[PDB]
């Protein structure tokens, strides 16, 4: 159906022109479930890390958003302990003109620049805001522990 045709186009474009730091695709016969990887940005406390994510496309894609969560634990104000991601593109501001490539770019961008408006993990947001030295230390420690 139309969802499957669209998902194939998303895969083709991503294979041909992937977002920097990012790879992704189906794990098996099911086109509706992908795994993705993001390399920790350089000049970030996630540097050297490899972070895995799970993408589930709904049956009415692209008219509803894909569901995207980290499976690698990560220390971040906008990403919670279940790997849930607080990013407008995934919920309030999804449109069918967007692609999984743009979602991955947006997640990368979020790793470098956390959103301070109504953060998903308030404690970590405080530490980012007020004690960057400690935030970077812990983020680096979790990178070593979970993402190496």
């Amino acid at each position: 159906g139309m969802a499957l045709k669209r998902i194939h186009k998303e895969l083709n474009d991503l294979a041909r022109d992937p977002p920097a730091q990012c790879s992704a695709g189906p794990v098996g016969d099911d086109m509706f479930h992908w795994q993705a990887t993001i390399m920790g940005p350089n000049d970030s406390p996630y540097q050297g890390g490899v972070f895995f994510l799970t993408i589930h496309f709904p049956t009415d894609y692209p008219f509803k958003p894909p569901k995207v969560a980290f499976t690698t634990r990560i220390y971040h104000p906008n990403i919670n302990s279940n790997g849930s991601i607080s990013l407008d593109i995934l919920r309030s501001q999804w449109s069918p003109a967007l692609t999984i490539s743009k979602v991955l770019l947006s997640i990368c961008s979020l790793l470098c620049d956390p959103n301070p408006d109504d953060p998903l993990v308030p404690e970590i947001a405080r530490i980012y805001k007020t004690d960057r030295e400690k935030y970077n230390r812990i983020a680096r420690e979790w990178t070593q522990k979970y993402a190496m």
Binding site: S86, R91, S92, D118, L120
Partner: protein, 76 residues
């Protein structure tokens, strides 16, 4: 009259209202019972998102009607 407002969890809130009550009035009423600011409430009846300035009568909401209460996304 009696109308019902169904929340996220399935919980049904009963309200007492006039047909000429505005949606804003109904949201203030819901605030009185659940303590949810009106700025965070969306009301839906028969597919339609209900406008603050309009009345219950504008949408032909009758006795024992059930509206949906859907809170606004917070993000972050």
């Amino acid at each position: 009259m009696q109308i019902f407002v169904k929340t996220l969890t399935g919980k049904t809130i009963t309200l007492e209202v006039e047909p000429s009550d505005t949606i804003e009035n109904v949201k203030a009423k819901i605030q009185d019972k659940e303590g949810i600011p009106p700025d965070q409430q969306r009301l839906i009846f028969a597919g339609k998102q209900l406008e603050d300035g309009r009345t219950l009568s504008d949408y032909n909401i009758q006795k024992e009607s059930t509206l949906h209460l859907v809170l606004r996304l917070r993000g972050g």
